[PDB]
Structure formats: C-alpha cells, structure tokens
Amino acid sequence: PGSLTIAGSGIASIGHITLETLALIKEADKIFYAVTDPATECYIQENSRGDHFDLTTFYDTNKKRYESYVQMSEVMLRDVRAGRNVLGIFYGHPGVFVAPSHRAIAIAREEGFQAKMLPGISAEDYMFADLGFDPSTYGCMTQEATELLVRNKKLDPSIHNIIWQVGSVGVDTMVFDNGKFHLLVERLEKDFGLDHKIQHYIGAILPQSVTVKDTFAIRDLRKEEVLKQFTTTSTFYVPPRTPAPIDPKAVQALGLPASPAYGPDEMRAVAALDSFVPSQEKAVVHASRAMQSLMVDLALRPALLEQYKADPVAFANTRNGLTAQEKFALGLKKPGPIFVVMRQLPSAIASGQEPSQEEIARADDATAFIIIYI
Amino acid sequence: KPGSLTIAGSGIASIGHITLETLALIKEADKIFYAVTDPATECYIQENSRGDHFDLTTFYDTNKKRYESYVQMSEVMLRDVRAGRNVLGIFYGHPGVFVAPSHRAIAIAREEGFQAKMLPGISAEDYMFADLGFDPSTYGCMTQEATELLVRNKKLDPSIHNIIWQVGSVGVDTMVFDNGKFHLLVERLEKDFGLDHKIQHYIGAILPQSVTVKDTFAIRDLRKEEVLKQFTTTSTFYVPPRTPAPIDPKAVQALGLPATVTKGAQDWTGFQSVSPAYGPDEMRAVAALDSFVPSQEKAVVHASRAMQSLMVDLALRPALLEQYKADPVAFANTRNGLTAQEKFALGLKKPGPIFVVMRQLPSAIASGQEPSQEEIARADDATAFIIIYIVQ
Ligand SMILES: Nc1ncnc2c1ncn2[C@@H]1O[C@H](CSCC[C@H](N)C(=O)O)[C@@H](O)[C@H]1O
Ligand SMILES: Nc1ncnc2c1ncn2[C@@H]1O[C@H](CSCC[C@H](N)C(=O)O)[C@@H](O)[C@H]1O
C-alpha cells in the first residue's frame, strides 16, 4: 500500500525544479529532503502538505557518512512500510553521486512496494550550460576523485573528463581540510603534464552566487592561494589534451564520406534563409483544447495517468470535448496515433479533412519521433 | 531595451521535465524558437507563451545538409536578439548536449555584446540513471556516441559504467535510419566484453502513452533479427562494468582511509555482486537511528515572508535579478517587510550571510536572540553549502 518516489531539486535554488516534481511536492503525504540552501528548503516546505523531514539531520562532524546514508534510507523505508506515499527529494539529480536514494528504491522493491526515481538537473548538466561544451564531441568521462584514486585509475587525455568531489579527497566523515588534495594533483600531473589547463567550476546555487569558471594550469594546483578555492562544492573540468585521430578505414567501413562565424558556407545558408521552401509540406500542431488539457493532465497528474492506463477508452470518454479521431487515437494507448492526430498537414486542415482511422492506427511508434541530433 | 538570448531545454518526457525557470521564461519571453520531439510539449510551449513563436524544425529537408539547417536556426534567433527582443530558444533534452545551433548562437551573441545564457535541461543520460537505477559515481561512467567511438578507434573500458548514444543510427544520419552498420558496434562490444556480457537497451518514455524500454541482452543476442528490430533513433545502451578494478589497500592507506575500506560504493542494478541490504554495519546504523543526538545543536530554517518572497522572485524573475545585482541595497529597500538584519545581509550580495539570516538555532529562536551584524558579515561563503551524499 505504501510507495516511494525519489526526485531532485536541481542545483540552482528553486529554478531547476521540474514541473512533475513540483506537482509531486504539492500532493505527497510525506516528504524527506536533503537540499543545500534555505530558500529551496522553505519553498519545498511551503508548497507541501506540511509533513516533511530534513534528512541532513543525520550528519555529524566526525560521524561516518555511510552511517548517515543508511539512516536517511531507513526513515523513508519506515514510512513506506507504514503505508505512506513517500516522496524523497535530493539536491541535483537524486541518482547522481547519491547513495541513499538507490539503496531505498532497491530495498523497497525487494520488499514488494512500488518505488521509482525521477531525474533532476545535475551539477554536470549545469556545467555543460555554464562552461558551454558538448560532451558528445569527444565523449565524456565522469568520476569521483576518491574513487578514482582508491582503484588506481588513470585519466584518458583524449576525451572530456569531469572530476567530482575534488574537495573531499579521502574524507569519510564531515571534516574537509583538503589534506589529501595533493594526491589528485599527482594523478593530474602524470596524465596531462604540468602545462595543461583545467577549469574550476562552481555553478551558482543562490541569486547571490557568482558562477566560478576559473582556468588553472596544473602547475599552479599546489599553490596555497589556489588550493584554498577548492571546496566541497567544486568540480573540475579537464578538457582533452590530445583528441584521438580519425581512422579513415573506420570512416569508410561506416559508409561515411572521406573558425570564423560567417564564412562562405554560413553566408550562403543565411542568404537562402528567407526564401527556403521545404520539398514537401510539413505538418503543424492541430489539437483541440480537450486534447491539450488531457495531455497536460497526464503529464502532471499521476492519479489521472493511472486511470488512463487502466482503461484508456473509458478515460477518453470522460473528455467529451475530444474530436472523434482524438478519442480513437487515445483509446489505442500508443505514441504513434498521438502524433497523427495532434499534428496535421495545413492542406488537410484547410480542407476540413480529418485523419482516417487507417492513418491514425497505421502510425509507426518507433519513427514518429524526429531526432536529427541538432 | 537591449536584446538578449537564453537557450533552454524541454527535457525528455513530455512537459513534466520542464524546469520552473524555463516555464517562467516561456511565459515572459518576447519570442520563442523551439525544436521539440512531441506535439504535447509543442502545444504546451505555445499555449503558455505570449504567442510569438517559431518551429526551428521547419529548416530541415531531405537533400539539405543538416549544417545549413543549423546555421539558419542560429540566425533566426540572432536576428531577433539584434532587433532588441528577449529571445528564448528551447531544444529537446538538455540544449547543450548534441545540439550544434545552441552553442553557435550563444557564442555569436556574446561576440556582438549581448547577454546570452544557456539553461540546463534534463538529458537522456539523466533519464537513464533514474530509469535503470545506477549512479555514474560508483565505478565512474564514460558516455559517448556510437559512430564517434568507431570513427576514432576508441576501446571501451570494461571496468567502468559505459553509456553509448545513437546506437540506432550507426554511421549515418539522414532519415533512412537503416541500421546497416550496427554490426560494427557489436564487434567493438564483443572485443571489449566478450559474448556473454549483458547490456541494457534503454528508451525513456516521451509521451504518457510511451512505455519505458529497459531490456537486458547478452552481446551474443545483438546479432539476432528479433533483437535488431528493437533499436530505434531514441535508443541508448547501458553497458555495466564487467571487470571493476579492486580497491587497492595501499591507495586506501595513502588516502588516510581506514583499512576497513575493501569495497567501492554499492550498485543495486543486479549486474554487480550485491551485498546484503542489512549486514552488520547497516544494522548498527539502523539501531543507532532513534537515539542519535548530534555533537552540536543544528540550525533550522527561519526566514520571514519578505525574505522568502524575495528569494523566490530572484529565482524566477530575471528582470528583478538584474535590478538586485545592479544595486542590492536599493533593491532590499523596496521590500520593507524585511528585517534590518535581512536587509543588511542582502546588501552584501554574498551567499554566506543569507544562511545566517535564513537559518537559526532553535535555542536562539526560543530566546528571541537575533544574529549580530558582525556575525552576518563574517559568514564564510566557502563553507556555507554542505553537499555530500556518497562515500567509499
Ligand atoms: N553548484 C555546484 N557547482 C559545481 N559542482 C557542484 C555543485 N553542486 C554540486 N557539485 C558537484 O557535486 C558534488 C556533490 S554530490 C551532488 C550530486 C547531486 N545529486 C547532483 O546531481 O549534482 C560536489 O563535490 C561537486 O563535484
Ligand atoms: N527517449 C530517449 N530515451 C533514451 N535515450 C534517448 C532518448 N532520446 C534520445 N536519446 C539518446 O540521446 C541521443 C542524442 S538525442 C538527445 C539529445 C538531448 N539534447 C539530450 O539532452 O539528451 C540519441 O542518439 C539517443 O542515444
């Protein structure tokens, strides 16, 4: 009867919370949260039904963090076992560099309860936006500073590297003095050399915060005045030193063919813009108010989504503002039909021509989603 | 009336992944340019907007270079910025992950002296961690595109988590999306992991009607016709570690960690050996829970309505944030519900003072003792935030 949902608050105070998460906060029976700033904390409390618990109460200066984490999981699990519909909220993404979330979800499931995790905005998400790089260009390795040292890993200088928790190297309690930071520096020196530059990143949590994105040569990382800047909030971005060369054999096997802002190619693209006409008519959105209302409700109201999934035809029949085609599409409970009814050709719209049941039902689920990784 | 450019994401799931700051900007922006994957998200953007919007996907066409399309996408945004409009661009997922026109527009805007910002959104990777239930930190996590992995002749490291994007269209974009080169990725997987190792095929649900795909396949299976048929343009692979590196006791020693550290942090997916949920160490922590008393009294949130109202406003209203930043003292003086202490803290425009006025000891609250101006001003920014949720 009890259940567990664990969601995130993101990084920036209030702004990074997702719409589905705010909806959960408003409806939940009980909220356990671990956030980093008072404005976010207050915002969660004030939007809630008023039954909440601060998970950070389990930390202590010289207490092993592992003990705190087990306790955080346990208070959530106790309420699940008691039959509450429990929401956990963790700073950032609740599954990224978080021990108690995955633990609680696994244990809940093992014991036969419904449990799920929702994504949130992570520190890496914030970093890509703030530092303005695309991880897909060379590939991107994520690692925790202590973990990489305890397992004697080497960093690959051909890719993007992101190193988290640089401010807590070798610490298992809550005392952070940078006493072992020099061990990470040694790793960096060996893998990248002394002249390679890294970026020290701290994304702005409060309005009063200023984004930190300072560059430091590795040769400067043992300086007292540099060292002092690395806190428990700090992440390092280490750009590639030596991207791996293209292999022409691989390119060929893949069937692939063998800077100024406004070069000739760009100037051509711009000149052609105002007159460009597609080779074929593109569909535009064409959805009734009823359809839009329903689709928003299904996105933001779990109770309604549950009812829809249990009996889609019946649920469609509760929204009589839907067109006949919309009702049919919704009754099928498949993604493709939704695309067919909600997006139509302007030529057909002008002709009063509604999509046929054949057109609706024939929709391919797989290739309805247009992703040309822009 | 200077133009400005903000690029945001829609996230992956229809509507629900949009961030509060993003919705706020949808409502307030002069003009919105968007490229999203589903019609419910598209309609939601339109219906919440000031009604001036443009679908960037209109620039796509067969026999048209994608790059030309991207330059045009950047240009329509920049034109409106130059004209003095408050411009919002929105892309599927996170707008900086596999999106070329976003980075380009921001760079040019900044070069020409405009304020230009990217906002994070929920990525496919983010959705995967939540749906498949692993943490990149436990073993480390390498994320890369299938074609690029092959083109640069990279090896997959079997000791870490691996995420592979774009498995559904190896070696070709286009629209034909015939996965005729997929076997080259399978070869790579076979070489690095062997045939018996298991991968997960992941598709996160976009629409309410979508069902999450999280099927496990042995690498042996990836050549089977009934398996190949499953892979699509929204497919991602998760490859769990096969051979994680052991904890080095000498490294543990050098790090000053106790000799009791013999294992990394726990992964719960079932791909790794999974310790009992309630072993002796866990039972100890649970038994200690009810009677735990911290070494020193902990502060609790304690903030005025005026302070909370202001802090929400600054998070959600860029024009107000701009005003505050320009003159924090004058701004605080427009909110006379603030205490003298709050006004002072806000005037410093630093995070550390905020913690002093927005959190207080329950003992100090009971006695009615307010924090001193000296206490507020001496607050250390570098130790205000406590952010640590894993350990070895
Ligand atoms: N504001 C911020 N700027 C940069 N890195 C940050 C940050 N907040 C957290 N981090 C990173 O995250 C680590 C704490 S663990 C926090 C993880 C959180 N669930 C998330 O999704 O991000 C820090 O040591 C640092 O490496
Ligand atoms: N619904 C979905 N589920 C799983 N992976 C997805 C997905 N949609 C896209 N992807 C993955 O994402 C790759 C790039 S498209 C998505 C890019 C988006 N900016 C983001 O933040 O993630 C695809 O090739 C695929 O591997």
Side-chain angles (χ1 to χ4, degrees), chain A residues 1-372, chain B:
Chain A
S3 73
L4 181 57
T5 308
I6 301 186
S9 64
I11 306 293
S13 175
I14 299 162
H16 284 176
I17 298 169
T18 68
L19 292 184
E20 72 176 348
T21 302
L22 175 60
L24 280 169
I25 287 171
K26 285 173 181 180
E27 282 293 291
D29 290 338
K30 175 70 169 284
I31 307 178
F32 295 86
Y33 60 84
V35 298
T36 73
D37 78 272
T40 304
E41 182 169 8
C42 289
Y43 184 85
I44 294 170
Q45 289 186 0
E46 292 192 352
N47 280 277
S48 77
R49 288 181 175 189
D51 188 13
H52 48 71
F53 181 106
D54 181 6
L55 289 171
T56 69
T57 59
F58 288 120
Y59 289 117
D60 209 357
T61 301
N62 303 117
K63 179 174 173 177
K64 299 297 189 194
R65 299 200 304 275
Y66 184 71
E67 185 177 338
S68 306
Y69 303 147
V70 174
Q71 288 170 340
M72 290 179 188
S73 298
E74 201 63 12
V75 290
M76 292 191 283
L77 288 168
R78 281 175 177 181
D79 273 354
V80 173
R81 288 161 188 149
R84 302 308 287 145
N85 293 295
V86 179
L87 176 64
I89 302 291
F90 291 87
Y91 173 74
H93 185 308
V96 169
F97 290 71
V98 180
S101 55
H102 293 287
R103 167 176 177 90
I105 287 165
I107 295 168
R109 287 176 175 165
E110 190 193 3
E111 287 176 22
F113 301 96
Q114 294 308 289
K116 69 175 181 310
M117 186 177 281
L118 301 187
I121 301 290
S122 78
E124 261 180 22
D125 287 325
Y126 211 5
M127 177 186 279
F128 306 139
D130 278 340
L131 300 194
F133 70 91
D134 186 341
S136 71
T137 58
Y138 298 109
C140 186
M141 176 67 186
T142 296
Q143 55 245 303
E144 203 247 351
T146 300
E147 187 275 333
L148 84 88
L149 292 172
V150 292
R151 281 188 171 117
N152 287 322
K153 308 302 269 195
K154 282 68 194 167
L155 297 163
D156 178 353
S158 73
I159 59 171
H160 302 288
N161 275 285
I162 309 181
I163 314 174
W164 299 54
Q165 308 213 308
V166 299
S168 55
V169 172
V171 172
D172 71 354
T173 64
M174 298 291 283
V175 180
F176 308 101
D177 57 4
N178 276 337
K180 299 292 173 177
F181 177 79
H182 68 282
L183 292 182
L184 177 63
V185 172
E186 183 159 67
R187 181 78 266 135
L188 284 166
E189 284 171 349
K190 286 176 179 196
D191 294 336
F192 290 89
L194 286 166
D195 295 319
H196 191 67
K197 281 171 176 157
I198 70 175
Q199 269 189 290
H200 174 222
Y201 173 63
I202 299 173
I205 297 165
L206 288 173
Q208 289 76 19
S209 300
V210 181
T211 306
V212 173
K213 47 184 191 178
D214 300 321
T215 295
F216 295 107
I218 284 169
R219 74 170 93 90
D220 290 346
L221 289 182
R222 303 169 182 269
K223 291 183 172 293
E224 184 173 23
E225 64 274 11
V226 172
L227 281 171
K228 199 184 154 297
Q229 298 177 49
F230 307 142
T231 73
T232 50
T233 314
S234 299
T235 301
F236 286 172
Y237 169 55
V238 188
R241 193 190 170 205
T242 50
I246 310 297
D247 178 3
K249 237 154 123 66
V251 170
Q252 192 175 80
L254 284 163
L256 286 170
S259 302
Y262 292 99
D265 290 330
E266 292 84 21
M267 284 308 299
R268 190 169 60 98
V270 170
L273 202 154
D274 279 350
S275 68
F276 168 67
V277 61
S279 66
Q280 44 180 125
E281 196 181 22
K282 295 183 185 288
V284 298
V285 289
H286 190 66
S288 72
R289 175 60 201 147
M291 188 63 172
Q292 296 182 49
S293 169
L294 174 147
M295 293 296 290
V296 172
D297 288 345
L298 295 188
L300 294 181
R301 296 178 59 178
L304 289 189
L305 182 64
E306 184 174 52
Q307 292 160 29
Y308 169 73
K309 282 182 189 284
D311 195 342
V313 172
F315 189 92
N317 275 326
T318 76
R319 304 295 181 103
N320 288 322
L322 290 168
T323 74
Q325 296 82 11
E326 282 165 352
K327 280 198 179 185
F328 177 68
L330 283 166
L332 292 175
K333 208 213 312 188
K334 288 194 190 308
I338 305 297
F339 279 77
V340 175
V341 289
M342 294 191 77
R343 283 178 176 152
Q344 297 174 34
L345 295 172
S347 67
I349 293 173
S351 303
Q353 198 172 68
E354 292 277 321
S356 71
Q357 285 196 12
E358 177 148 17
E359 281 158 351
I360 294 163
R362 90 173 168 214
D364 193 334
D365 281 355
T367 54
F369 305 94
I370 292 96
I371 288 89
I372 311 159
Chain B
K1 291 192 156 299
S4 65
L5 179 68
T6 305
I7 311 279
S10 68
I12 303 292
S14 177
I15 298 159
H17 283 178
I18 296 170
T19 67
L20 295 188
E21 65 171 0
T22 304
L23 179 59
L25 187 44
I26 286 164
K27 291 180 183 172
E28 193 74 354
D30 292 330
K31 179 124 177 223
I32 308 180
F33 296 87
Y34 61 82
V36 298
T37 81
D38 79 90
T41 300
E42 186 175 355
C43 286
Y44 182 81
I45 291 164
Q46 290 189 4
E47 83 169 337
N48 281 279
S49 77
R50 289 187 172 179
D52 191 7
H53 47 72
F54 183 103
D55 178 7
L56 292 172
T57 72
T58 61
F59 284 124
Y60 291 128
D61 198 1
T62 51
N63 300 124
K64 170 164 178 183
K65 281 186 165 77
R66 299 312 188 198
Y67 183 69
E68 179 169 325
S69 288
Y70 300 152
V71 166
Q72 286 170 340
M73 290 180 195
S74 297
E75 199 64 15
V76 290
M77 293 188 286
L78 289 164
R79 284 175 174 177
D80 281 325
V81 170
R82 291 168 187 147
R85 314 303 294 144
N86 174 26
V87 178
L88 169 63
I90 308 168
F91 296 85
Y92 177 66
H94 186 304
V97 176
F98 274 96
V99 179
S102 57
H103 294 287
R104 168 182 174 83
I106 284 167
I108 294 171
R110 282 183 188 176
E111 187 187 345
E112 303 181 10
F114 300 102
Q115 294 303 116
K117 186 181 201 219
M118 183 180 289
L119 306 186
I122 303 292
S123 69
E125 187 170 21
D126 283 336
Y127 210 1
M128 176 182 274
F129 299 135
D131 280 341
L132 295 193
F134 73 95
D135 180 346
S137 76
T138 54
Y139 297 93
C141 185
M142 178 64 190
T143 313
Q144 65 196 313
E145 193 260 319
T147 299
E148 185 230 53
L149 157 75
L150 294 175
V151 152
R152 293 190 188 269
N153 192 64
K154 312 306 300 301
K155 173 193 188 310
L156 294 167
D157 182 344
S159 68
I160 62 171
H161 297 295
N162 277 284
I163 301 177
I164 312 175
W165 287 302
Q166 208 177 250
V167 298
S169 72
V170 178
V172 72
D173 289 39
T174 58
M175 78 146 289
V176 67
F177 292 118
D178 171 54
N179 214 15
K181 302 304 177 204
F182 175 79
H183 67 99
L184 290 171
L185 176 65
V186 177
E187 286 179 24
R188 180 76 269 156
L189 290 163
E190 290 174 352
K191 289 179 193 154
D192 295 333
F193 292 90
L195 290 168
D196 291 340
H197 189 62
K198 288 175 169 185
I199 66 93
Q200 276 197 294
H201 173 220
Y202 173 62
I203 307 168
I206 298 163
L207 286 172
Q209 291 81 11
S210 297
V211 299
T212 306
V213 178
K214 48 183 175 157
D215 296 322
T216 301
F217 296 115
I219 286 157
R220 185 181 306 282
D221 297 332
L222 296 175
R223 293 181 181 277
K224 290 174 176 173
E225 296 298 320
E226 70 277 12
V227 174
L228 284 169
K229 270 306 292 183
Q230 308 306 316
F231 309 138
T232 76
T233 61
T234 48
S235 296
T236 305
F237 284 174
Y238 169 54
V239 190
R242 180 169 182 258
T243 59
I247 300 298
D248 178 3
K250 280 153 187 276
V252 170
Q253 198 265 299
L255 280 161
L257 283 164
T260 51
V261 177
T262 54
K263 310 269 276 155
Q266 181 71 68
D267 175 87
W268 297 90
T269 60
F271 288 117
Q272 312 304 320
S273 56
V274 175
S275 297
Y278 292 98
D281 298 306
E282 295 73 30
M283 290 301 283
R284 183 188 69 246
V286 171
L289 196 165
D290 283 345
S291 62
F292 171 63
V293 176
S295 61
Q296 319 285 350
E297 190 186 17
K298 291 183 184 309
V300 294
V301 69
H302 185 75
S304 73
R305 178 53 52 206
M307 189 68 175
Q308 182 66 188
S309 284
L310 176 138
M311 297 291 292
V312 173
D313 283 348
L314 292 180
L316 295 178
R317 300 166 71 174
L320 295 193
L321 181 54
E322 187 172 10
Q323 285 173 29
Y324 170 70
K325 278 184 174 171
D327 190 347
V329 176
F331 194 89
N333 277 331
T334 68
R335 303 291 182 105
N336 291 330
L338 289 171
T339 69
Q341 290 90 3
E342 284 167 344
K343 282 199 185 176
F344 173 72
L346 280 166
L348 295 177
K349 196 176 63 181
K350 302 189 190 294
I354 305 298
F355 279 76
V356 178
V357 296
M358 290 193 79
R359 305 186 87 245
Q360 270 150 245
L361 295 184
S363 70
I365 291 163
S367 85
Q369 184 204 350
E370 283 268 16
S372 87
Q373 192 155 295
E374 285 68 33
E375 287 161 10
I376 294 162
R378 75 154 185 261
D380 187 358
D381 292 351
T383 54
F385 301 92
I386 300 147
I387 324 176
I388 190 136
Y389 309 96
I390 56 138
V391 64
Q392 297 311 298

